[PDB]
Amino acid sequence: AYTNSFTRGVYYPDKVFRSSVLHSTQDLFLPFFSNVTWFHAIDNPVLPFNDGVYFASTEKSNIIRGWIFGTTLDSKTQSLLIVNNATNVVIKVCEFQFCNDPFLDNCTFEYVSFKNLREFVFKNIDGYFKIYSKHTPLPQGFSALEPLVDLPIGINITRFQTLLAAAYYVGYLQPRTFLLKYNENGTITDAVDCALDPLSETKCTLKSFTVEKGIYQTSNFRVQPTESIVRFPNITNLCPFGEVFNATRFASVYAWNRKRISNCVADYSVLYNSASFSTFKCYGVSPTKLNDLCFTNVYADSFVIRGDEVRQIAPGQTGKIADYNYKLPDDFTGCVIAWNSNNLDSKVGGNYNYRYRLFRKSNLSYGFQPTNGVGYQPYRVVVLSFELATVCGPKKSTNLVKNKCVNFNFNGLTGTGVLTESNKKFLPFQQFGRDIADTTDAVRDPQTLEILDITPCSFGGVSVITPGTNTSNQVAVLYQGVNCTEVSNVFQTRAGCLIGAEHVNNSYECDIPIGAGICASY
């Protein structure tokens, strides 16, 4: 069963003494009016421990005499054995050998220190395992919890399980700002949650409890980006690689063709994915960054050589053919691709058009049989050489969505906002769009030629309209500059959304200035 922990979980954040001060500490706490799960032991399954738990109980017999923390409870994760024998709050942080069900009725650390409420707030900050308490015989009251004991265990705990030999609660503490109220004697007489209701963060900003009738800029409103829009022009300007690999005739071994590739986009991902290409060896480049980065001065060398000469064209290779045919540079950057072509470039009668140079001064026919080896079969070789502009891969291309705060990225520029259909016309060479402030104000997407603006996300202030706390507790919430469709009775005005209050067609001399015309009252 679930119940309402109204104002429970308000302890002393420090042993510092303070007198009659409204001190605001951003300490992890059980939120006001949170959801606290009442348990009944009639079993006791494992219970959560996020940032400590606001424990509580109402027993006239002291039936709870056991805590078991930790994760494994097999003498591996550091568990605890807190027990209360009605004479002293003895705390055992050592390891006991628990079986399937720990027995009711080698240790590391041992320590000793119906008409009753037994609250047992925990904490774990800086390895300082605090154990609070308060016994005030869940009502609509308020009782601060003093730091009964503290334990410098310095271990990580995230799960616990209350154990006994029938009403044991649990809590959830979250990093909530929290405004305290000390009396003269230095104890906590009242408290205020911070993110509970608009009046709560009003009290947070004012750092008081008796708020006056007025409007307070407690925070600012912001619309976060929803998704990402990355767009690049059409891939229709593909590189003419289809006619290069499918050419009927290829050049000779001594007349290898070199071609420049530019002003086009090529999908190398499929090129290195499928391997109808027998050899694919890359040096000086990372295939991981091939799709994410592009190179400059890309050159393609295409020729046909026999199979066994593929590995000879490589750095650190010595031989007659390698030295007298083609020398690769020490800092060669690119990929070497070679594939079989015996199905299309071979004839039974044999081709005598291939000739080789026998003698050379200084550095810069074939027997076709069914049983001949692969190395004697002709192989087409294409080598792509890269140097570390105008030619790059498609990278990423996402669709366009408008009328919603997104993260648009046109051609490689950042910026988040909401895109609007426009009418103003550009010049064909012009892409950007700016006002006097030199900030982007319009754009043409790289794929089509339609002109769409860029207007910032619907941000602004968010103020709380309240009467005095002595007058009322329900409040209005202004939203500054933002229309009232982004964010009770909604109401739109030039000031913005005013969730909470009611439009009135009448008009009186107003008391709480809203903005841009409206006033609120009670």
């Epitope: 066994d308 000469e309 593929v310 590995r311 000879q312 010595t318 031989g319 190395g375």
Partner: antibody, heavy 118, light 91 residues
Framework: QLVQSGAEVKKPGESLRISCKGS????????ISWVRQMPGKGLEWMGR????????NYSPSFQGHATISADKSISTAYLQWGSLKASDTAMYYC???????????????WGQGTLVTV | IVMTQSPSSLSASVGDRVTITCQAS??????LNWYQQKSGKAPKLLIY???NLETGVPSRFSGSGSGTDFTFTISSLQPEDIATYYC????
């Protein structure tokens, strides 16, 4: 011919080992290349191991998923995986590389059979 | 090296689920094929790597199986899928 193992008759969840044994020559004196192929497109090349000097040329696309190990006690090359998953469906080639006296690399012999399943 | 496919024959209505199996012998790693081949033409081979997914491959085609058998399920017969599916032996 290079001798390997054939298909499956066994239940899932069992650990198993393969081999690539050559005859008529010293297995440790010849380069062995492992090439990965499986249903749908061409090959992938991850690298080769030379047990004489432990020189490994790792392909950049390889991300340290398949550990490379050698057994010098039996002078046999075995391939093992540190962590197996359901998504490990791959087949591995084993072929004889260039001769020790030859400085030119070639692939003259290919495998004889390993049709593969777990 | 012997290959068998099961079931030998089956009867079903249009659009019914079709499941076929392919069997094996010995001790091995993990990778095996399926091909789409006509009566006397070259086989066809759609998805690749069984652990990588090819872009442009329709998601309606999938493969499974562990230990011995491989299960290929045809959710809906298509006019362009009228052929015999072969698990093919090579090395």
């Amino acid at each position: 011919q290079l001798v390997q193992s054939g298909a499956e008759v066994k239940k899932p969840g069992e650990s198993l080992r393969i081999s690539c044994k050559g005859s008529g020559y010293s297995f440790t004196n010849y380069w062995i290349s492992w090439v990965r192929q499986m249903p749908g497109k061409g090959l992938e090349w991850m690298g080769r191991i030379d047990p004489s000097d432990s020189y490994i040329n790792y392909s950049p696309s390889f991300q340290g998923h398949a550990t490379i190990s050698a057994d010098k006690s039996i002078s046999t090359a075995y391939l093992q995986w540190g962590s197996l998953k359901a998504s490990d469906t791959a087949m591995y080639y084993c072929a004889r590389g260039r001769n020790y006296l030859d400085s030119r690399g070639r692939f003259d012999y290919w495998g004889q059979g390993t049709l593969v399943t777990v | 090296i012997v290959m068998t496919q099961s079931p030998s024959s089956l009867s079903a209505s249009v659009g019914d689920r079709v499941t076929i199996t392919c069997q094996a012998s010995q001790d091995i790693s993990n990778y095996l094929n399926w091909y789409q081949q006509k009566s006397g033409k070259a086989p066809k081979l759609l998805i690749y790597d069984a652990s990588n997914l090819e872009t442009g491959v329709p998601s309606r085609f999938s493969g499974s199986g562990s230990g011995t058998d491989f299960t290929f399920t045809i959710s809906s017969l298509q006019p362009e899928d009228i052929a015999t599916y072969y698990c093919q032996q090579y090395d």
